[PDB]
């Protein structure tokens, strides 16, 4: 209540405070507790193999230099005080680009406790790398992690833990990606060794399951409809050369445009995806339908009736095998 | 352990320290050792002729002004101390855009040693130029370098070396580019002379080998399938003018759309690439197939049988010569 008294207390705390030295410098490591409140996952990019996360990132530790007596309150201080305090040198090892939000002020919190516990909160948006295995795309499941580490302090000096264990990360229910469902999240803690020493690591990972629905509609259904269209030829009279050759060409060429368009939406991976396998099967069907007419044309100057049954039957088999293997 | 003692020692180190003067100013050059730990190569752009690298960049040197006694520890200091120290004026001569990561703090380390050795680490993402020779594209091998130099200090004042020789650069195994394999990396050291004097240079280069697989699927296979499609005409009766002319047109026009699309994904180079040569060969085949019908049409108002053998045989020869020359 007495603001001069509080001002005196806080001034005393910061008098001769050396930001250069961690708490308990030269002694046992400082234990830093971390909890995350997820705000959003804005974007997941296959082409860039990354995702964009917004979170409230909080750090808990004790700094005995900041302990104060005679005030039975937790002091919430203006965020600019953070520039006069030691804070951990935490970074995100797999981040590509990150920033602290700055409107209307830097989205930062400092709360002091009588025993010298410091609560330091930041609101961060990070674009973080996530290498994806697209062999089963778009029937794939991905593992995207966020790796949290101390930059310069080894485990001799700093230690990390998930504050609250399995409850340290909140807000997973808020994630609303149209193309993915969050199946699971996991929290891991370990030490990572480099040439410069052993460093504390915390890892947050998510399991993402792609929703098929968009792909059924966008690529699978057009390809099925083109393949069915190709079969119309077999009900046309063999003398209708222009009509039957037109059907063959248009379906074959449409299947090429669909293929090439699709792979321009994705990174230039050297392997065959699940969707590639489907489109290649559909291409073979429609190409053989045109070649069937070439054969009919070749001998007429029977086969159609055999084609009317064998082609739909083979395509059904093809689809059955495909969707069983991958679903 | 005694933080007041450590604070006193460090305060004494920085008392009267002149950041303007390099260590051993006016004397022999300061030897600066460099080590890189590669985190990722995020992107390689043919259109922009550049690549994006993330690395941990470390600098090692001795500053006798920072030597301290009576503490048998290496002091890891808060990264903000870097603003009170001399550091080398290292830059990347072929970089286009670079930044030091800033969340949650500046990704920077300072470690002092009792003998006055300073360890200065930065986590940097750089987009760096890489002029590519696309004459054999996409069967090409590229050499992309990173050129590291002192901006203002000549070799009279500063010297660079790879700390650890051939082990100075780690993490090459981490690079995961879908479209490229890293064949080799090399470390070079030399002096570079400009009008303002001789400057120390370190060069890190990689040899990148393009993976063919994507290109086989995306461009080569469609072109082969269009060329085969063109041959169907020769099995169609010569009276089927609409059918056979349709085949000629559609294949010719499809080959033009493929060509023009492809070169819109690439820089506006004035020379012919390997892929251009293939597409031009395929165009000639399908164009001649249509012209073959014009000739047949021209005289009927034999040639087809001769076309049924000579065209597939010539295309096989064409492919053989092409893929031998370039693979």
């Amino acid at each position: 209540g007495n603001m001069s008294f509080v001002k005196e207390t806080v001034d005393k705390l910061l008098k001769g405070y050396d930001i250069r030295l961690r708490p308990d410098f030269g002694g046992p490591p400082v234990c830093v507790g971390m909890n995350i409140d997820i705000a959003s996952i804005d974007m997941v990019s296959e082409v860039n193999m990354d995702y964009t996360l917004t979170m409230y990132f909080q750090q808990y530790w004790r700094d005995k230099r900041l302990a104060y007596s005679g005030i039975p309150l937790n002091l919430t201080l203006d965020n600019r005080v953070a520039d006069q305090l030691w804070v951990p040198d935490t970074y995100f090892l797999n981040d590509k680009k990150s920033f602290v939000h700055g409107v209307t002020v830097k989205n930062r919190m400092i709360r002091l406790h009588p025993d010298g516990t410091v609560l330091y909160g930041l609101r961060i948006t990070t674009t973080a790398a996530c290498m994806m295995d697209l062999r089963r795309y778009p029937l794939d499941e991905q593992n995207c992690t966020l790796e949290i580490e101390s930059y310069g302090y080894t485990t001799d000096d700093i230690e990390f833990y998930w504050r609250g264990g399995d409850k340290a990360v909140t807000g997973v229910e808020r994630i609303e990606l149209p193309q993915f469902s969050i199946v699971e999240h996991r929290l891991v803690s370990r030490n990572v060794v480099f040439a410069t020493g052993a460093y504390p690591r915390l890892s947050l990972s998510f399991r993402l399951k792609r929703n098929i629905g968009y792909f059924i509609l966008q690529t699978y259904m057009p390809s099925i409809l083109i393949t069915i269209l190709s079969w119309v030829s077999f009900w046309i009279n063999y003398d209708a050369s222009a009509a039957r050759v037109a059907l063959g060409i248009t379906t074959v060429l449409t299947m090429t445009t669909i293929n090439t368009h699709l792979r321009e939406t994705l990174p230039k991976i050297p392997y065959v995806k699940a969707i590639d396998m489907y489109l290649m099967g559909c291409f073979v069907f429609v190409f053989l339908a045109l070649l069937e007419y070439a054969f009919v044309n070749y001998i007429f100057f029977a086969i159609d009736r055999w084609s009317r049954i064998v082609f739909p039957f083979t395509f059904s088999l093809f689809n059955l095998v495909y969707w069983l293997y991958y679903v | 352990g005694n933080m007041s003692f450590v604070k006193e020692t460090v305060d004494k180190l920085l008392k009267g320290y002149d950041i303007r003067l390099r260590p051993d100013f006016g004397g022999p050059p300061v030897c600066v050792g460099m080590n890189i730990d590669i985190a990722s190569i995020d992107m390689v752009s043919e259109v922009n002729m550049d690549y994006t690298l993330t690395m941990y960049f470390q600098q090692y040197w001795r500053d006798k002004r920072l030597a301290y006694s009576g503490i048998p520890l290496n002091l890891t200091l808060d990264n903000r101390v870097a603003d009170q120290l001399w550091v080398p004026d290292t830059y990347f001569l072929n970089d286009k855009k670079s930044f030091v990561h800033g969340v949650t703090v500046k990704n920077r380390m300072i470690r002092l040693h009792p003998d006055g050795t300073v360890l200065y680490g930065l986590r940097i993402t750089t987009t760096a130029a890489c002029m590519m020779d696309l004459r054999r594209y996409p069967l090409d091998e590229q050499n992309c370098t990173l050129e590291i130099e002192s901006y203002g200090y000549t070799t009279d004042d500063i010297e660079f070396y790879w700390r650890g020789g051939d082990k100075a650069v780690t993490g090459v195994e981490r690079i995961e580019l879908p479209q490229f394999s890293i064949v080799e990396h090399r470390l070079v050291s030399r002096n570079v002379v400009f009008a303002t004097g001789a400057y120390p240079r370190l060069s890190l280069s990689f040899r990148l080998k393009r993976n063919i697989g994507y290109f086989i699927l995306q461009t080569y296979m469609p072109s082969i399938l269009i060329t085969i499609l063109s041959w169907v005409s020769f099995w169609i009766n010569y009276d089927a003018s609409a059918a056979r002319v349709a085949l000629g047109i559609t294949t010719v026009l499809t080959m033009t759309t493929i060509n023009t699309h492809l070169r819109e994904t690439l820089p506006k180079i004035p020379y012919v690439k390997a892929i251009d040569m293939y597409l031009m060969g395929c165009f000639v085949f399908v164009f001649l197939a249509l012209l073959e019908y014009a000739f047949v049409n021209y005289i009927f108002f034999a040639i087809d049988r001769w076309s049924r053998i000579v065209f597939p045989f010539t295309f096989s020869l064409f492919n053989l010569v092409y893929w031998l020359y370039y693979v």
Partner: nanobody
Framework: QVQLVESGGGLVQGSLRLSCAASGHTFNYPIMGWFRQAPGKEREFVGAISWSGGSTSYADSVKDRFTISRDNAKNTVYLEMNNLKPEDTAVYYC??????????????????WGQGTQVTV
């Protein structure tokens, strides 16, 4: 979750080919390492290979003696131990490293350890 089974050790006086067959989620663990533990001594780095690319690294002791490579079809890595020496007498272990799990050289960075072939010469 990776399982590693290694074979082709044994006792010889010579060229040898240790093999290391992986199965499971190998995508999350792109690097395979070869270690060796002599009796008494600490577990020691030999070499490592990326599954994708085959980017290779060797300890000095075995540089220009041993050669590692792999085949992604079988999910197999092999240490071709040529020009053997009586120093090369240890339980050779295979291990997998996570993408972000630190330096190649440090066995504590590795998660999934093969059984370990004893090799004496």
């Amino acid at each position: 979750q990776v399982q590693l089974v290694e074979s082709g050790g044994g006792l010889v006086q010579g060229s040898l080919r240790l093999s290391c067959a992986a199965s499971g989620h190998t995508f999350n663990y792109p690097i395979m390492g070869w270690f060796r533990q002599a009796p008494g001594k600490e577990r020691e780095f030999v070499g490592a290979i990326s599954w994708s690319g085959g980017s290779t690294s060797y300890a000095d002791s075995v540089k220009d003696r041993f050669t590692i490579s792999r085949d992604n079809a079988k999910n197999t890595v092999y240490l071709e131990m040529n020009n053997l020496k009586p120093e090369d007498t240890a339980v050779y272990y295979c291990a997998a490293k996570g993408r972000y799990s630190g330096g190649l050289y440090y066995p504590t960075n590795y998660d999934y350890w093969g059984q370990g072939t004893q090799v004496t010469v």
